[PDB]
Design a protein around this ligand. Sequence first.
Ligand SMILES: OC[C@H]1O[C@H](O)[C@H](O)[C@@H](O)[C@@H]1O
Ligand SMILES: OC[C@H]1O[C@H](O)[C@H](O)[C@@H](O)[C@@H]1O
Lengths: 182, 179
Amino acid sequence: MKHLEEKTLSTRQIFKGRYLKIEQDQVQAPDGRTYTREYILHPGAAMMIPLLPNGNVVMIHQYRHAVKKVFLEFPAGKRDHNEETLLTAKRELLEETGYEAKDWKFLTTIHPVIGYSNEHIDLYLARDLTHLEQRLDQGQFIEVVEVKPADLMQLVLEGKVSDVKTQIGAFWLDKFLRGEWN
Amino acid sequence: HLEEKTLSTRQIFKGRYLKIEQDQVQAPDGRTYTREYILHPGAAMMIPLLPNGNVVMIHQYRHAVKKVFLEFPAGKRDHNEETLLTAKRELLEETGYEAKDWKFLTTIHPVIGYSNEHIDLYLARDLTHLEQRLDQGQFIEVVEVKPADLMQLVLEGKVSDVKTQIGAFWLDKFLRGEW
Ligand SMILES: OC[C@H]1O[C@H](O)[C@H](O)[C@@H](O)[C@@H]1O
Ligand SMILES: OC[C@H]1O[C@H](O)[C@H](O)[C@@H](O)[C@@H]1O
């Protein structure tokens, strides 16, 4: 699909807020003309599906101000210092929920904002869990819950798992639990 | 008791396409924090199902990630119109199709950490093939895809666009008679 590609002619960081950094590019498109492209520069991230011995998954409730609501999510966070995302996933599982896992499996990489961010999220399945203690940052507010996967799938259908990364996790888990994808 | 209360708001950035809101909020610890996110108008995406059982999809280059994606057609809400209007227009502009049977599936939030974007996903059936009407700067190829092939592509990591991957999973549930 080389005939669809756009070639970068110029780049600049047009804005840096408290948290968000925006790149503004000029690109040459397949018509040979020049167009502006704008996107957030994001470090990447990891999310995991932590599957307990009893078959439930460990999830969280977290308020997200950008949408003004509380979401049911799988634990996740941003990639720090360009680390391997497996390290990101281990740290975030520990900090957000207090769990460690003996068995980690990479599932897939998703891109949640292809129109305006370079963000990718690596999704992992975590098994053989043991509990320790949740360790939250100042400014981080998280309630931990156990969810039955059948109940999760019904919530997806009902529109109650609108967070894309978590919904995608639910569908990958469903495939895994049914023995279709493993 | 997780809800954060807005103390102030301002639009700190407006570029060619992106707008950033910055709020001061009071959190459950009673302390003040900054929250920063993209102001997005919302969007629709749709899954156009053909009588031969294939779905209409697109290939589109996405500069933010520097690759070509397989996507279901989509676009941004214009002038706070109903997202079904958005879906009808974008299906016609991006793919050249019209549909007489539309069904809302679900609403997703692709960027809960830093955008208020929502995308409403629809299933479209009973299709007529007219022609694309692309905007300047828009480059899209239309392809026809077998759902079984799509699901294998998802497994292989070749449908990394969250909205399209989600559409694939919903379609799989619909086709399997489960939902
Ligand atoms: O899952 C996302 C959460 O973790 C990430 O590290 C980010 O800092 C922010 O978006 C939120 O705190
Ligand atoms: O699907 C997304 C596409 O459509 C939307 O209307 C936006 O303008 C932009 O992200 C892209 O051109």
